[PDB]
Amino acid sequence: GKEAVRANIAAVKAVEEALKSTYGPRGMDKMLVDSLGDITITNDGATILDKMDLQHPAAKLLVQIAKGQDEETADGTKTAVIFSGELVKKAEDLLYKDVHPTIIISGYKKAEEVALQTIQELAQTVSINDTDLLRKIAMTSLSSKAVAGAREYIADIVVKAVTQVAELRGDKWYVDLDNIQIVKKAGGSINDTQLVYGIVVDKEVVHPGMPKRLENAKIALIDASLEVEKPELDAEIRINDPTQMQKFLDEEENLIKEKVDKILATGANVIICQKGIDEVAQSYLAKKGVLAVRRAKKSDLEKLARATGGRVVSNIDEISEQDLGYASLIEERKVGEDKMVFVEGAKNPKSISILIRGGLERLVDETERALRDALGTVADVIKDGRAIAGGGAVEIEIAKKLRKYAPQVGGKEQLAVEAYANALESLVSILIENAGFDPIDLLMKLRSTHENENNKWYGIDLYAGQPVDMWQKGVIEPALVKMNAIKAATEAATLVLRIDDVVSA
Amino acid sequence: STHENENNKWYGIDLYAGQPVDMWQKGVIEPALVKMNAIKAATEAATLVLRIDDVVSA
Amino acid sequence: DLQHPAAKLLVQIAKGQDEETADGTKTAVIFSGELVKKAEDLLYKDVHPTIIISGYKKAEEVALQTIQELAQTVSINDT
Ligand SMILES: Nc1ncnc2c1ncn2[C@@H]1O[C@H](COP(=O)(O)OP(=O)(O)OP(=O)(O)O)[C@@H](O)[C@H]1O
Ligand SMILES: Nc1ncnc2c1ncn2[C@@H]1O[C@H](COP(=O)(O)OP(=O)(O)OP(=O)(O)O)[C@@H](O)[C@H]1O
Ligand SMILES: [Mg+2]
Ligand SMILES: [Mg+2]
């Protein structure tokens, strides 16, 4: 009976009330204070559920199906929880009316069916030629981010960045996002961001008298040191005579000139490593006419290997012409007071990098977050091909469409369907609420102007406050993220109904 | 009232005389950037407090 | 010594300055809390914070430009 079922529903209603004010734009941020007293203002759905201790089994089970994703995007997480907890909310009112859950499941399952298929016979075909569209869909992701510093600048980048990487695979475009590096240098201006055609290494060339820009680079990616190593690294030496000393530390220093001659044996003109270059070896490279980089991050040597077609060499006695990385031109370039190596004209044409400049020290990170996400949304639309209008449009229709279905479904199962439709309008009602307008007024002004096909892309513009076309204001979203979120969400909702008892050991 | 005309823009308040006067023409002049970064500082904080809905703690 | 999150957050935005000499630091705190104070009086009339933020923002604008289109040019030879 009532026994355990309340506790589950209650636990869920609780989580809903924790995120409610933060759904869509105009959302009212939450403050999170750590155990050592450190403060975080945010609206990240995920963290707020993860970072919490939920006593109840029920909540964690619901957030487990809601939060997650098995694809390379992280969008739909606030809608997934909320629509789910509203569906749980709306189901209680049927248990009050004395409708068994076996009926509510069959009703909602049948409603969900039609509700799913109404995104299929409505989604719009978006391909690679619609680059004037990805610009919009992109901005639609960045616009509710914290930073308002030149987002058009960044929105344009995300398009160029995904369309460059786009490869025709199995007669359909695919995008392997890993072909994009992100480097950030705080300050200057956000307007100074640009896209680099090639991998970018954040360290300098070890002597400025080497070539500024070197022609037809035969790079040598060297993992092993090019500096002497210690005979006293763990503990002190056992030599007693300095003549014996000498001949040790002498032959080990001729071992680096040996390594340098083994690398130039290959015809290398530039050389990058992740360990040192001895000062007698900088001097050795200066006299030969070679361009050397000392202690660069191996994390970007890896990324520079499969971009220039070279190999990250762990033994200087194994380097071959085969292993030298090729690039049309390598140079060192200055950014304020810092200098990085850039390697344009690399053999892999898909491998590119983004250089962020501007903002404050923590804001620049969030600009990187936003860009990760923005590349995501655009890539995932491309990978799919389908995209619907945001702003509650496709939602309001699945409600209207469900309500027309309701009569025909049967007795009690009509009320299930009619509830499902009501839970879906409640979503847009929360969104309207959080804008500071009346949910009923606007819900009705819209759901009457949505009966004819002429108004398919009508939603509610969260700053105007009256029904308009969101498609023609750039507010579009991935048709499949908002499709797997609903499937996920209903699964969870009805799982909360499935529980007759909880037995704890 | 004595600042209604545009000619009396540099009017402020005499802190010893105690009467509205033109401070430019009395030697009390100040860096124009300080009373500008103050305003940006203050509104950021202001608008940010209003942005907090509720508090969670460890 | 403040443990209230909001106060610690406030003092951080107000006190700190990214330039060598620091002035306006008393002004910064009073005007901030006053902007917060005078906003309370609108909340009391049931007005929602998203309006008050956008209201103030549009005002911050006018307020900023009103210092620019008015300052007098001082140089190395105005000793
Ligand atoms: N300017 C706008 N006017 C109207 N609706 C908007 C606007 N911008 C976005 N929306 C709608 O707001 C809805 C909810 O936004 P949000 O993206 O915050 O929910 P979410 O996708 O579940 O959260 P997250 O993106 O963090 O996972 C979106 O699905 C979108 O259609
Ligand atoms: N005799 C005076 N007549 C008019 N105003 C005066 C006079 N002396 C001081 N002032 C005004 O006093 C104001 C406030 O000074 P104060 O420096 O204490 O504020 P603050 O700059 O916020 O504090 P701090 O400099 O420590 O950060 C100045 O902006 C200045 O114009
Ligand atoms: Mg989203
Ligand atoms: Mg002062």
Automatic annotation (TrEMBL), chain B:
<comment type="similarity">
    <text>Belongs to the TCP-1 chaperonin family.</text>
</comment>
<feature type="binding site">
    <location>
        <position position="15"/>
    </location>
    <ligand>
        <name>ATP</name>
    </ligand>
</feature>
<feature type="binding site">
    <location>
        <position position="35"/>
    </location>
    <ligand>
        <name>ATP</name>
    </ligand>
</feature>
<protein>
    <recommendedName>
        <fullName>Thermosome subunit beta</fullName>
    </recommendedName>
</protein>
<feature type="binding site">
    <location>
        <position position="35"/>
    </location>
    <ligand>
        <name>ADP</name>
    </ligand>
</feature>
<feature type="binding site">
    <location>
        <position position="30"/>
    </location>
    <ligand>
        <name>ATP</name>
    </ligand>
</feature>
